Symmetry: C3
Subunit: 137 residues, 3 copies
């Protein structure tokens, strides 16, 4: 299923030196996000750093949300994951997309400008309205 989503480029290297996120194959669930940094960031074991993407999206449709996830290789092999575990992006959010990068392992790790450091999926979401009851059926 396909959806056009408005994107605003906030840093002029995004789409040039730091490519825009894209899906590898027609069958990929997620796209890789890149670190928009001026210089490398050394991330010590146990530490968290906030990494900019240099872009904003506007999903706009309240039936859709995005979820940011670690990359599998980085998480398994290097312990490079997300400080909020999963990043939930609201349909009405229009600020810069930010990545909370957390080193959950035992070795220091260099976050390089342009590196594919996390990934993101778009999933349908349902807004609940609670119906108070005394007992369930």
């Amino acid at each position: 299923m396909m959806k056009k989503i408005d994107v605003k480029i906030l840093d002029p290297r995004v789409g040039k030196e730091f490519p825009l996120p894209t899906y590898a194959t027609s069958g990929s669930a997620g796209l890789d996000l890149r670190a928009c940094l001026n210089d490398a960031v050394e991330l010590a074991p146990g530490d968290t750093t906030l990494v900019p993407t240099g872009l904003a999206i506007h999903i706009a449709d309240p039936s859709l949300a995005a979820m940011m996830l670690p990359r599998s290789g980085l998480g398994h092999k290097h312990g490079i994951v997300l400080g909020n575990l999963v990043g939930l992006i609201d349909s009405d959010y229009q600020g810069q997309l930010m990545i909370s990068v957390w080193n959950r392992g035992q070795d220091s790790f260099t976050i390089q400008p342009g590196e594919r450091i996390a990934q993101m999926i778009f999933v349908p979401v349902v807004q609940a309205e609670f119906n108070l009851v005394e007992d369930f059926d």
Copy 2:
């Protein structure tokens, strides 16, 4: 997309002193869950505690599930996340909704009664039936 979902209030402060979960905007993907506690809980670095919500839901439709996630600020800034990382809520689950709160950071943290300590999204889910094959197409 909208869905009415049956809720049973298990603690009489829920909906009064401890407001029921609600979506901030029409475009919010998730709603914030509150700690239903008699007194604050001090959570040391590395530790896990089980936090009640004082409510039960019954999703009932097997095409829907909920996922509990950390809040982004708490996770990034304070290392306050979930001990099971993501909490998966089945459509036929009718028990109290519980939150496994884990301090993944280096500073002790006070969990206060009524605090918005996690969030929850409802997503469509598909039940797979496995079809055994010798080779894929």
Copy 3:
């Protein structure tokens, strides 16, 4: 919602000594995955190990993905979760399903052959096409 999904058995114990994953109830969101191991694996606090399932799936429909998650009991009570936090499975992936198991707690843990060590959900996904804009609406 239901979907037949092609599965290839890679280890002849899968479907015999190590049962194939199944949903507990008609209302379960996820199914439990089992460790396909010759012998137990002792996993020390802080450590990560790669656990085979002995099977491959081919989702095939680009409108669907799977997400691997910790089990709630294992994560909350034992600190046995996933090294990549959430495992994202692409529709065009045809390799062995692997589980990155991470001990985030303080006690060593024995991973036994056949144990239900994680769970997996199938969710619809949307592929985004970015539409560059100067300003949002």
